[PDB]
Amino acid sequence: MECPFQIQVCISDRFFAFPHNLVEPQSDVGNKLIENLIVYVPTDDDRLYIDKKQFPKFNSVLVYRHEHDVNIDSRSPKKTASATIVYWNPLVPITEIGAGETRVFSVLLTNNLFYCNTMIVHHENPKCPIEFTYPNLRPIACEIPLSHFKELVESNDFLLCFNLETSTMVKILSLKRIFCIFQYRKQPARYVINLPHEEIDNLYNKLNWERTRRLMKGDVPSNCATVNRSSLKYIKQAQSLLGIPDYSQTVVDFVKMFQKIIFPYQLVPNVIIKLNNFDQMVKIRLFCKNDSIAISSSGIVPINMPDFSPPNTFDYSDYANRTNINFVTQRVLTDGGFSSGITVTPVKYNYYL
């Protein structure tokens, strides 16, 4: 994928609402500013949230729903020197560009904009929402969050709904905008997405890839992540086994519970191990400030060393042999009076014992 340098993209959670102030007329080759402005939006309804009166710099303002023009190759979009072109949360390739630099504002960072040369990323202090999967909720038409803006900034229990024929990209953009609104909420808000589990998982995967793109473009890390459905099911099983009411315990706090074990016992909690495995299907390593070693799923590892020590570091032949293994297994079977379900494995060792 290639992008034309004439497009400049700014990424900011704030862009869930259109940045009227940031728009500015572009100049032609003759350095003549263009008083005509064209704003592109992903859906027709978006037009209602563009206030033409907020563009004093321009004399004429028009708004249209950006639509993939199959007749134009995005590698070289047509230019329209007669107007300044701005795209808001584009979901399809930009086939048209304005005078000077075509401006783009987006809360999402799809591949289309990923290769865009000029990338301005606004940084925010993270503020995470609460996943509240559960069958007094406040329904929210995700396609039009700004309509529910007041409720989104006031209440704390939202049922996220979508029109049947809503497109996947529209869903992704709506979710991103809602999550930005929550990022600006002082109080985290619980929400439930009225969608099939697989669809929600795919949406979360795409959002994760978008966040990865933002990071690669220089965005600040945010702990406000999301959990795949299998991971949520595992966490729920763990909480139930421990006798923890699901509504009472949040996943984040549940995981944090084992930070007391992480360092002092120099062990990786099994919950974190399982979550990492789920993400991999969709290894671990960490340390402490000034620490000389790293705790990993494999055990202790010298800092900066590979996750596994050289193969010949330790000789296990003494016990890592069929004779010893069979002897131990037979002893166990005899002592316990067992006949099946018994399995003994030699213990290997990483860098350290």
Binding site: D45, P135, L137, P139, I140, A141, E143, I144, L159, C161, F162, N163, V192, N194
Partner: protein, 58 residues
């Protein structure tokens, strides 16, 4: 069932408490009541989310 369909939590609670203190509640009446309540609540939880989405639907 009616006090569940119609959102009458006071009546539902009254019935639940009366059944708690009526007859051999613990033996099997409690389980039967919980089963009926769970079935009704499952149906209502199936319906209400879609109903709200339809309400806010464009």
């Amino acid at each position: 069932i009616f006090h569940l369909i119609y959102n009458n939590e006071n009546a539902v609670n009254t019935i639940c408490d009366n059944l708690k203190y009526t007859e051999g509640f613990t033996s099997n009446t409690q389980r039967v009541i919980h089963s009926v309540y769970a079935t009704t609540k499952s149906i209502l939880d199936t319906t209400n989310p879609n109903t709200f989405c339809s309400r806010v639907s464009r």
